[PDB]
């Protein structure tokens, strides 16, 4: 019989070409989305566009480290992530031109430092992230919205955001389901990065079945929900047929996504500087 | 309207045997930990342990491991303590309480505390 | 394992007095301190929770603030409902340690 959830209820939603017939088995994996907004909030002139995005794109790298080290202290069960995630070992022998760009070994996380390797240090010794986002750019999901988990126009790293807010997505696939473990890894975020007024709803897990000059603020409203909604269609069977994974005649649960708010200062925005973008911009 | 009921005053000899019991209202105990606290005079608060009502599954501090042993019932929604080599030591106001936030680990609601007294 | 200790065990105060209790941790708890209230009746309350939150419920006269090893409770305005014992929990390691009491009463 399928997994059982009592808080969070079930909703159900194929993609076209009580308990549907298809809902029987335990899914494929379930797909848990930590939506990051950040903002360098207190702004500035003589502050460059690319100032805009380079700061909150270099906390991606801390935020995974969290994410990844966090343990359930008095745990009754799962302890860690490693206890519960998707565990991938390679890409296929063919498409080999992905490695160091998607996870090979261990669990299956997918965010935008996944570009730079997870490294802070290449990260920081790379003096454009513009090219560096859009180098593999042609379909299929793009690497850009597989790494991103969102659809690209909602991110904000361009040199013409206006509003000068970035969201993007750290994607963890797992292969079990713990509630003390993941309300655990959503409180711990929430209390590290509060968000103002998050409004998101966190009572729903969707199962799809794939046939064949002033301050700015951090807002979170209705176009924040359910943002996966906006992806390709491809985007889940494209991420996972990377790994020899099929959704041919199974379904994924994709539960309700844990919101993060990052603010930065002009300290950091300066700081975070790769000295030779100064000239271009 | 989230309550945990506590039993009476309970008196008893040094060497019995008690059971404690917490009764909880508003909530299943089955949805969260159930702790037991120990205020003594002079010594403050101090954590017993705690079981959680889904699995079974209690722990304790060091000091009770042989000492304390936590259950629960779901089906009447009570958790229990039940205390074995009662001693004068054991003399002391007990706390039933849960926690909500599985990062901070507060203890939101607490039982009125209920009274053991080891005498002879 | 973590010994929590509040420097004054009782504090003499005023009405609309402002207020602070201070604890200390013997090591680093990264924030992780809980603001407990005891009436002389006996039944406990939380009042903050990770150093500086606010629980539901909990007039607005109360505040958190503190870090590394040190950490303190601070009552804008004592009120007369607010004559109790005050504890400060500890969730970082995993045997939940509180600190001795400090008890807070009217200047006589």
């Known amino acids: 019989g399928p997994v059982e959830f009592s808080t969070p209820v079930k909703d159900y939603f194929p993609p076209s070409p009580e308990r549907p017939d298809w809902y029987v088995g335990a899914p494929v994996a379930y797909i848990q989305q930590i939506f990051v907004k950040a903002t360098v909030s207190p702004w500035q002139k003589n502050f460059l566009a690319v100032d805009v995005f380079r700061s909150p794109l270099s906390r991606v790298f801390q935020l995974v480290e969290e994410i990844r080290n966090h343990a359930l202290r008095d745990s009754s069960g799962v302890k860690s992530l490693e206890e519960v995630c998707l565990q991938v070992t390679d890409l296929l022998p063919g498409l080999k031109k992905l490695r160091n760009l998607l996870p090979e070994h261990g669990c299956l996380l997918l965010s935008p430092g996944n570009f730079w390797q997870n490294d802070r240090e290449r990260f920081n010794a790379d003096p454009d992230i513009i090219k560096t986002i859009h180098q593999h750019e042609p379909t299929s999901a793009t690497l850009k919205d597989l790494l991103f988990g969102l659809p690209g126009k909602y991110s904000g790293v361009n040199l013409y955001n206006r509003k000068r807010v970035v969201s993007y997505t750290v994607t963890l696939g797992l292969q079990r389901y713990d509630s003390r473990f993941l309300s655990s890894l959503r409180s711990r975020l929430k209390l590290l990065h509060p968000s103002p007024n998050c409004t998101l709803r966190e009572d729903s897990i969707v199962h799809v079945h794939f046939k064949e000059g002033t301050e700015a603020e951090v807002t979170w409203g209705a176009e924040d929900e359910e943002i996966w909604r906006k992806l390709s269609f491809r985007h889940w069977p494209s991420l996972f047929s990377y790994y020899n994974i099929t959704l041919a005649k199974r379904y994924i649960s994709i539960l309700p996504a844990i919101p993060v708010t990052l603010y930065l200062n002009p300290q950091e925005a300066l700081e975070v500087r790769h000295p030779q973008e100064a000239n271009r911009y | 309207e989230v309550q945990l009921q506590q039993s009476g005053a309970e008196l008893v000899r040094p060497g019995a045997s008690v059971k404690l019991s917490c009764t909880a209202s508003?909530?299943?105990?089955?949805?969260?930990?159930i702790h037991w606290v120990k205020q003594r005079p002079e010594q403050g608060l101090e954590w017993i342990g705690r079981?959680?009502?889904?699995?079974?599954?209690?722990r304790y501090a060091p000091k009770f491991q042989d000492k304390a042993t936590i259950t629960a019932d779901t089906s009447s929604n009570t958790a229990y303590l039940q205390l074995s080599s009662l001693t004068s030591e054991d003399t002391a106001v007990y706390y039933c309480?849960?926690?909500?936030?599985?990062?901070?680990?507060?203890?939101?609601?607490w039982g009125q505390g209920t009274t053991l007294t080891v005498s002879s | 394992d973590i010994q929590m200790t509040q420097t004054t065990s009782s504090l003499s105060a005023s009405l609309g007095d402002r207020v602070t209790i201070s604890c200390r941790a013997s090591?680093?708890?990264?924030?992780?301190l809980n603001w407990y209230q005891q009436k002389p009746d006996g039944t406990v309350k939380l009042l903050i929770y990770?150093?500086?939150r606010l629980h539901s419920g909990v007039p607005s006269r109360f505040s958190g603030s503190g870090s590394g090893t040190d950490y303190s409770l601070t009552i804008s305005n004592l009120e007369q409902e607010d004559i109790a014992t005050y504890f400060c929990?500890?969730?970082?390691?995993?045997?939940?340690?509180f600190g001795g009491g400090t008890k807070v009463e009217i200047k006589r």
């Open positions: 508003g909530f299943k105990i089955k949805d969260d930990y």
């Open positions: 090591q680093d708890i990264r924030n992780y």
């Open positions: 990770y150093t500086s």
């Open positions: 929990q500890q969730t970082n390691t995993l045997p939940w340690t």
């Open positions: 079981i959680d009502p889904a699995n079974g599954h209690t």
């Open positions: 309480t849960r926690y909500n936030d599985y990062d901070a680990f507060y203890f939101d609601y």
